Design an enzyme around this catalytic site. Structure first.
Site, short mmCIF file in Angstrom:
data_model
loop_
_atom_site.label_atom_id
_atom_site.label_comp_id
_atom_site.label_asym_id
_atom_site.label_seq_id
_atom_site.Cartn_x
_atom_site.Cartn_y
_atom_site.Cartn_z
CG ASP A 25 -1.90 0.77 1.16
OD1 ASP A 25 -1.96 1.70 0.17
OD2 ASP A 25 -2.99 1.07 1.83
CB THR A 26 2.35 3.37 -2.62
OG1 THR A 26 1.09 3.50 -3.59
CG2 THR A 26 3.19 2.23 -3.23
N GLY A 27 -0.28 4.19 -0.63
CA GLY A 27 -1.02 5.23 0.00
C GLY A 27 -1.05 4.97 1.44
C1 LIG Z 1 -7.69 -0.48 4.53
C2 LIG Z 1 -8.23 -0.77 3.12
C3 LIG Z 1 -7.06 -0.86 2.17
C4 LIG Z 1 -6.08 0.19 1.83
C5 LIG Z 1 -6.79 1.76 1.80
C6 LIG Z 1 -5.75 2.69 1.60
N1 LIG Z 1 -5.79 3.98 1.41
C7 LIG Z 1 -5.27 5.32 1.90
C8 LIG Z 1 -5.82 6.57 1.63
C9 LIG Z 1 -5.16 7.86 2.07
C10 LIG Z 1 -5.85 8.38 3.30
C11 LIG Z 1 -7.15 8.76 3.29
C12 LIG Z 1 -5.11 5.07 3.62
O1 LIG Z 1 -6.04 4.67 4.27
N2 LIG Z 1 -3.88 5.30 3.91
C13 LIG Z 1 -3.73 5.50 5.52
C14 LIG Z 1 -3.57 4.09 6.05
C15 LIG Z 1 -3.16 4.05 7.47
C16 LIG Z 1 -1.79 4.36 7.79
N3 LIG Z 1 -1.55 4.97 8.95
O2 LIG Z 1 -1.03 4.26 7.32
C17 LIG Z 1 -2.90 6.52 5.86
O3 LIG Z 1 -1.73 6.54 5.37
N4 LIG Z 1 -3.23 7.33 7.05
C18 LIG Z 1 -2.38 8.51 7.23
C19 LIG Z 1 -3.11 9.95 7.10
C20 LIG Z 1 -2.85 10.43 5.70
C21 LIG Z 1 -3.49 11.42 5.59
N5 LIG Z 1 -3.41 12.36 4.35
C22 LIG Z 1 -3.39 13.47 4.10
N6 LIG Z 1 -3.44 14.44 5.05
N7 LIG Z 1 -3.16 14.14 2.82
C23 LIG Z 1 -2.12 8.26 8.87
N8 LIG Z 1 -0.92 8.46 9.22
O4 LIG Z 1 -3.06 8.02 9.59
N9 LIG Z 1 -7.47 1.85 0.46
C24 LIG Z 1 -8.81 2.48 0.75
O5 LIG Z 1 -9.15 2.83 1.58
C25 LIG Z 1 -9.73 2.14 -0.45
N10 LIG Z 1 -10.49 1.07 -0.18
C26 LIG Z 1 -10.54 -0.02 -1.08
O6 LIG Z 1 -9.76 -0.04 -2.07
C27 LIG Z 1 -11.34 -1.26 -1.03
N11 LIG Z 1 -12.01 -1.28 0.54
C28 LIG Z 1 -11.40 -2.26 1.20
C29 LIG Z 1 -12.38 -1.98 2.63
O7 LIG Z 1 -10.69 -3.03 1.07
C30 LIG Z 1 -12.33 -1.42 -2.08
C31 LIG Z 1 -13.23 -2.58 -1.76
O8 LIG Z 1 -13.10 -0.25 -1.93
C32 LIG Z 1 -10.78 3.37 -0.74
C33 LIG Z 1 -9.82 4.58 -0.90
C34 LIG Z 1 -11.85 3.36 -1.78
C35 LIG Z 1 -11.27 2.94 -3.31
#
Ligand SMILES: CCCC[C@@H](CN[C@@H](CCCC)C(=O)N[C@@H](CCC(N)=O)C(=O)N[C@@H](CCCNC(N)=[NH2+])C(N)=O)NC(=O)[C@@H](NC(=O)[C@@H](NC(C)=O)[C@@H](C)O)[C@@H](C)CC
Lengths: 99, 99
Positions: A25-27
């Site tokens: 997960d690069t995101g």
């Molecule tokens: C858990 C589900 C799979 C991984 C997740 C990763 N998405 C990134 C999105 C960017 C933020 C909104 C993420 O949540 N990243 C978090 C992961 C948690 C972490 N700590 O690493 C993150 O980096 N969070 C940062 C905050 C980033 C804030 N960014 C900003 N202000 N620009 C954090 N430190 O808490 N994917 C998703 O959320 C996507 N979900 C999906 O692809 C699938 N859903 C499921 C439930 O699998 C599909 C069936 O819908 C969404 C976008 C729909 C297409």
């Protein structure tokens, strides 16, 4: 390897002697795993995703293998929908995005 | 390019005549953009991840330029905390993960 994106980039990981599936997960800033037991003390962390925020347990310096590649670093444990391998460990295994 | 993962992998996109910054998210099935206008018909969708679900509008056949590379596909629009480029468009620009 090279992993294309036509399907979810799922790999096998090993943590606590157990094999699990997780998403490259690069995101994701961090690595977040579903409920399991890890050794040692933990610290609190709040993380955010598409739907809002959750509380997780932060464990440091955890030994983990990602698709056969060894890493040692922070693992967050809590109510994530899916196990995700984030940038903190992807950098340890030398992963890049290329196009 | 080759994009390392020491920091969040942000790119400029062009969509609907507008420039936006977006996150390359190999953990996202779909592309999700903050509120904006797009042409054509739409239908509602619920999408989930950490923190639960949000409701979005699904637009199909949307042309987009990601870091200079053109693609066409579905774009979801709604109250996402960050603009996200997901796998549906990353495949089209030839993006892979390498380690
Ligand atoms: C858990 C589900 C799979 C991984 C997740 C990763 N998405 C990134 C999105 C960017 C933020 C909104 C993420 O949540 N990243 C978090 C992961 C948690 C972490 N700590 O690493 C993150 O980096 N969070 C940062 C905050 C980033 C804030 N960014 C900003 N202000 N620009 C954090 N430190 O808490 N994917 C998703 O959320 C996507 N979900 C999906 O692809 C699938 N859903 C499921 C439930 O699998 C599909 C069936 O819908 C969404 C976008 C729909 C297409």
């Amino acid at each position: 390897p090279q992993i294309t994106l036509w399907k979810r980039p799922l790999v096998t990981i090993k943590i606590g002697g157990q094999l699990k599936e997780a998403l490259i997960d690069t995101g994701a800033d961090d690595t977040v795993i579903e409920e399991m037991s890890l050794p040692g003390r933990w610290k609190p962390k709040m993380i955010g995703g598409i739907g809002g925020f959750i509380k997780v347990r932060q464990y440091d310096q955890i030994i983990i293998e990602i698709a056969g590649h060894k890493a040692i670093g922070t693992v967050l444990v809590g109510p994530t929908p899916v196990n995700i391998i984030g940038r903190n460990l992807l950098t340890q295994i030398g992963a890049t995005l290329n196009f």
